[PDB]
Amino acid sequence: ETVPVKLKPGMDGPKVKQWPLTEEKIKALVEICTEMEKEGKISKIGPENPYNTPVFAIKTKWRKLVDFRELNKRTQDFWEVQLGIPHPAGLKKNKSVTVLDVGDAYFSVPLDEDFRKYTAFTIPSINNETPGIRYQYNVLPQGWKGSPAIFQSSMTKILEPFRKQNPDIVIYQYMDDLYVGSDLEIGQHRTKIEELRQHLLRWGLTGYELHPDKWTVQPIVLPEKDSWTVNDIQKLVGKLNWASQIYPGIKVRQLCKLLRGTKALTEVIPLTEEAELELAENREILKEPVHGVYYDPSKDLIAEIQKQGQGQWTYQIYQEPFKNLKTGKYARHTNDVKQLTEAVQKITTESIVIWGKTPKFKLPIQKETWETWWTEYWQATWIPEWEFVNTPPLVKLWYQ
Amino acid sequence: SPISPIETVPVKLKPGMDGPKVKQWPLTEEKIKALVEICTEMEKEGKISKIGPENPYNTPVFAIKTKWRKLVDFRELNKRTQDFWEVQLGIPHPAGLKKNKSVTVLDVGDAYFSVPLDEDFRKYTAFTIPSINNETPGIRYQYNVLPQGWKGSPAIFQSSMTKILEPFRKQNPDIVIYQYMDDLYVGSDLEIGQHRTKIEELRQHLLRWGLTTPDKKHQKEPPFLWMGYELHPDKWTVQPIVLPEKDSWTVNDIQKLVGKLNWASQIYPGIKVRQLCKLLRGTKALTEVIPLTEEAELELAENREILKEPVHGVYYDPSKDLIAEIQKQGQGQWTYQIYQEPFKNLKTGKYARMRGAHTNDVKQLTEAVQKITTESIVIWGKTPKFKLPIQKETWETWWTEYWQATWIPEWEFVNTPPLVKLWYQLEKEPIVGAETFYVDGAANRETKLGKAGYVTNRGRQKVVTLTDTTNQKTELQAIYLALQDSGLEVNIVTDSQYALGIIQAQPDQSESELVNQIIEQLIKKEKVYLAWVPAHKGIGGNEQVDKLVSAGIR
Numbered sequence: 034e035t036v037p038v039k040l041k042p043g044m045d046g047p048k049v050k051q052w053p054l055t056e057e058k059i060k061a062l063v064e065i066c067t068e069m070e071k072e073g074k075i076s077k078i079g080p081e082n083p084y085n086t087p088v089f090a091i092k093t094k095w096r097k098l099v100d101f102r103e104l105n106k107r108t109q110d111f112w113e114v115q116l117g118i119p120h121p122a123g124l125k126k127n128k129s130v131t132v133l134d135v136g137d138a139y140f141s142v143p144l145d146e147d148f149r150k151y152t153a154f155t156i157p158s159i160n161n162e163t164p165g166i167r168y169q170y171n172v173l174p175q176g177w178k179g180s181p182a183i184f185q186s187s188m189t190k191i192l193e194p195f196r197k198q199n200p201d202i203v204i205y206q207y208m209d210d211l212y213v214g215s216d217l218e219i220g221q222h223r224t225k226i227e228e229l230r231q232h233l234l235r236w237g238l239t240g241y242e243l244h245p246d247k248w249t250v251q252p253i254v255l256p257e258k259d260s261w262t263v264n265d266i267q268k269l270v271g272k273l274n275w276a277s278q279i280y281p282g283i284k285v286r287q288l289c290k291l292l293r294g295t296k297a298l299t300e301v302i303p304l305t306e307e308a309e310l311e312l313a314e315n316r317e318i319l320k321e322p323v324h325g326v327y328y329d330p331s332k333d334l335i336a337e338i339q340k341q342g343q344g345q346w347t348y349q350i351y352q353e354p355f356k357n358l359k360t361g362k363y364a365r366h367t368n369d370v371k372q373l374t375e376a377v378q379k380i381t382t383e384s385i386v387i388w389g390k391t392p393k394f395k396l397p398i399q400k401e402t403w404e405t406w407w408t409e410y411w412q413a414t415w416i417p418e419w420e421f422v423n424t425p426p427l428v429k430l431w432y433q
Numbered sequence: 434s435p436i437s438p439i440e441t442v443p444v445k446l447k448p449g450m451d452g453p454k455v456k457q458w459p460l461t462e463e464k465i466k467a468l469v470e471i472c473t474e475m476e477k478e479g480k481i482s483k484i485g486p487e488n489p490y491n492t493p494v495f496a497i498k499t500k501w502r503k504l505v506d507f508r509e510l511n512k513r514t515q516d517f518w519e520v521q522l523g524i525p526h527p528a529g530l531k532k533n534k535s536v537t538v539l540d541v542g543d544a545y546f547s548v549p550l551d552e553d554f555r556k557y558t559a560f561t562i563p564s565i566n567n568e569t570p571g572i573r574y575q576y577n578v579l580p581q582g583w584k585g586s587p588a589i590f591q592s593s594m595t596k597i598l599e600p601f602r603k604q605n606p607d608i609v610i611y612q613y614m615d616d617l618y619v620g621s622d623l624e625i626g627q628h629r630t631k632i633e634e635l636r637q638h639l640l641r642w643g644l645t646t647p648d649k650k651h652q653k654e655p656p657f658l659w660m661g662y663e664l665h666p667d668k669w670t671v672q673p674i675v676l677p678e679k680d681s682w683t684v685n686d687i688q689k690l691v692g693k694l695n696w697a698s699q700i701y702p703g704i705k706v707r708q709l710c711k712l713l714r715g716t717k718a719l720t721e722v723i724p725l726t727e728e729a730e731l732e733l734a735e736n737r738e739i740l741k742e743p744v745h746g747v748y749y750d751p752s753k754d755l756i757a758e759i760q761k762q763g764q765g766q767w768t769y770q771i772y773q774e775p776f777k778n779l780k781t782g783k784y785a786r787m788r789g790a791h792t793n794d795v796k797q798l799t800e801a802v803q804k805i806t807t808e809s810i811v812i813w814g815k816t817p818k819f820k821l822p823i824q825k826e827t828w829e830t831w832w833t834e835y836w837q838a839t840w841i842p843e844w845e846f847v848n849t850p851p852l853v854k855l856w857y858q859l860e861k862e863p864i865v866g867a868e869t870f871y872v873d874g875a876a877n878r879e880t881k882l883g884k885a886g887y888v889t890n891r892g893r894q895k896v897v898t899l900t901d902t903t904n905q906k907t908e909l910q911a912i913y914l915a916l917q918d919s920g921l922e923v924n925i926v927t928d929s930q931y932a933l934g935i936i937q938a939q940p941d942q943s944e945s946e947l948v949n950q951i952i953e954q955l956i957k958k959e960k961v962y963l964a965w966v967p968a969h970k971g972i973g974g975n976e977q978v979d980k981l982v983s984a985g986i987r
């Protein structure tokens with residue numbers, strides 16, 4: 034039997050254009066899809082199906098990545114407020130969290146007949162020489178948020194013995210992945226993961242290691258300097274001025290008294306000591322979490338990323354601007370685009386671990402550059418939503 | 434003419450909609466007679482069939498002119514028919530095709546009429562030939578085949594051909610077939626003997642599936658005219674482009690000129706369009722005569738010289754790398770060529786786009802590279818190796834220091850002037866022994882009046898009144914003032930992040946004349962340090978300009 038799936042009232046399926054693919058990725062997709070077709074997982078379709086979802090190939094074994102972002106938006110009522118999967122608050126506290134790909138489970142469960150048409154995708158040809166090869170899914174597809182929603186009861190049955198035997202191990206499912214957290218010593222944790230893999234193996238389904246307890250704040254750093262120039266203090270008060278917009282109780286009044294009258298920038302001026310009460314107690318609030326800022330589950334998460342140079346990247350996650358839920362950094366034969374894709378993936382998994390959802394990214398890159406290159410370095414089975422923005426000039430050095 | 438024995442494609446109406454019921458308009462006797470003759474012949478061919486008055490659906494028919502033809506107005510049925518998958522997401526570019534020994538065109542006789550329509554959808558295609566005046570009930574027909582002008586016909590015909598060609602393709606994998614509407618293009622590297630024999634195997638395979646094709650004496654000879662191209666199995670070019678020599682140029686004539694030149698730029702190197710396009714901005718009616726600007730005349734003359742001799746492109750060899758070279762033609766204008774063997778171009782092209790109000794040549798070059806990179810993946814399924822008129826050092830410096838991420842595929846420097854460079858740079862550190870200017874602007878949004886000025890560490894001062902201005906313009910004006918009156922080395926402090934952002938990106942060209950005036954001053958300078966401070970925080974010099982420029986404004 035199949036569980037009936039319906040779209041959000043008043044809207045129909047995705048009609049997203051297939052992006053241009055390289056020669057090697059088309060050939061890889063053709064091999065993958067020919068094999069899936071033989072196994073009955075997908076079937077060729079006719080032109081009476083007007084729907085499309087983009088498809089990509091990622092990595093030594095080639096794998097298919099279907100971009101269901103649009104279908105997921107149009108089925109949100111189903112996987113969120115009909116068959117929603119709860120997110121545990123304990124996962125982010127764990128000493129170790131292991132990510133296991135569990136997507137192979139989904140092809141054993143048939144997809145609802147009347148929904149199969151919305152899963153339509155195309156393998157394009159080079160230079161539009163031949164019509165695209167068109168398919169739809171017969172089974173729960175990887176990348177669709179409805180899949181873990183439907184498989185939910187089957188996964189519970191699979192994990193039951195392991196969860197009973199290991200009550201202090203947190204297991205969380207998000208899309209194609211299983212997130213497994215414990216406070217055990219690393220050797221014991223890895224032994225328990227292997228144990229879990231054996232349970233999964235008996236059901237067919239078949240890692241990546243995180244340490245969330247060591248995720249600490251990225252504080253705005255004020256410079257310790259001996260001998261300040263006029264330019265140095267101007268840069269300092271500007272950093273503090275913006276810092277006060279996010280942190281409740283940052284003062285800068287004493288520092289500004291040093292800059293009175295029209296002075297040359299290279300003029301070295303000695304500091305008083307009335308400013309040290311500000312300077313030192315500013316560092317106190319800067320190292321601590323923001324008071325009054327909490328995650329609202331009814332609001333989207335937004336992630337901003339700044340390129341800092343030297344292979345370093347700063348990022349902030351918020352829902353209302355200035356109200357940072359999390360800040361951090363990413364550090365590195367690595368190019369700008371490769372580093373950015375890696376950072377996006379890193380920020381996304383942290384976001385999955387902490388809140389149980391992905392942020393919408395504001396990327397400091399040209400749209401077309403990102404679109405041609407991102408799959409070359411992408412390794413995750415999900416895809417976050419993204420915007421393309423112009424990094425404001427001073428946000429960079431303020432988070433430096 | 435046969436009807437293909439292939440499986441039918443199931444068709445539906447749009448959800449919540451029923452079939453069309455638009456009534457038949459009375460026709461003249463001669464039109465009715467003409468329709469009756471056409472419809473009885475179509476009925477004998479199996480294309481249409483008689484139906485009774487139990488069918489509630491109707492689509493109007495019309496007769497148009499020695500011979501007559503029948504027009505079925507499917508507007509109402511099309512509106513009610515489901516959406517289909519698109520017939521194609523793009524067309525092949527000739528540059529991406531591989532060289533063949535022989536290529537033959539085969540057209541399908543009466544394309545749509547040779548493929549059956551879904552039996553359960555046939556009732557919705559009903560039409561009525563009206564009787565003379567009102568009197569008699571009309572003659573009612575429905576379609577058995579894909580109707581001309583119906584929404585689903587293009588896609589269902591293509592899908593049918595794909596299924597028909599599939600067996601033949603699989604057992605003849607080294608023969609290339611391209612489907613285009615009712616045409617088939619068939620190429621191979623077989624000897625002239627077994628190529629003509631191979632076409633006959635295809636023709637018999639197609640005839641087996643109810644599709645008739647022309648024989649050796651009827652099929653066209655190369656070059657084939659297709660989609661504005663002229664195609665040999667050995668080379669390709671654009672179709673004959675003739676620039677008219679006119680005394681007076683109308684908007685319509687210039688629009689058509691630009692269209693032709695744009696089309697030509699695919700294979701004719703160095704084609705320019707900028708000056709001709711400038712003539713078409715905010716332009717009047719199509720019949721309006723536009724006097725040719727002197728720059729437009731020179732551009733036209735350069736284009737005529739380029740198009741003087743015929744030029745062809747070569748085809749693609751998948752065993753060799755693609756090489757893309759780019760040259761700067763002038764401000765905003767870029768041109769490129771793609772080849773595999775030095776200077777035998779597969780195709781050419783141009784880039785001009787202005788991404789953002791203010792830019793430099795380094796940014797434009799990268800934008801050009803990304804445009805060509807995308808084009809290359811579409812056409813050849815791979816990226817080319819680039820040869821660019823920019824030093825590795827210049828490129829290195831820019832990318833590292835800029836806020837935006839980028840990646841250019843493998844590229845080499847090539848000494849083809851003009852070389853890409855930055856025309857100035859901002860200091861990392863404040864200058865010792867240089868005058869420090871504090872700048873600010875203020876604008877009144879009611880009156881659009883404003884002031885721009887500066888105060889300096891050396892007690893210098895100036896304010897200039899402006900009349901139709903904005904906040905942003907006054908901040909730029911203030912910075913421009915500071916540059917004008919400063920001398921070779923300057924420290925400038927602004928509270929405008931907008932102004933800071935523009936200048937830090939080292940622009941060499943802008944849509945604003947004011948920014949261009951700033952750029953001109955920045956190049957003349959020896960050393961410039963531009964710093965930012967927050968507005969209204971009691972910062973010495975900054976507070977002094979603010980009071981100065983806000984006086985009488987806010």
Ligand SMILES: Cc1ccnc2c1NC(=O)c1cccnc1N2C1CC1
Nearest residue numbers: 530609611618619620659664665666
């Ligand atoms: C119109 C068209 C578009 C796409 N491909 C082709 C053609 N026609 C050609 O004449 C042609 C030229 C050379 C090689 N391939 C060609 N063919 C390929 C099919 C044999």
Ligand SMILES: O=c1c(C2CCCC2)c(O)c2cccnc2n1O
Nearest residue numbers: 873874875928929930968969979983
């Ligand atoms: O006077 C202002 C004000 C004032 C007008 C309203 C109060 C502050 C600004 O906000 C401001 C913001 C960016 C750059 N320059 C600015 N200036 O010059």
Ligand SMILES: [Mn+2]
Nearest residue numbers: 873874928929
């Ligand atoms: Mn200002």
Ligand SMILES: [Mn+2]
Nearest residue numbers: 873874968979
């Ligand atoms: Mn001001």
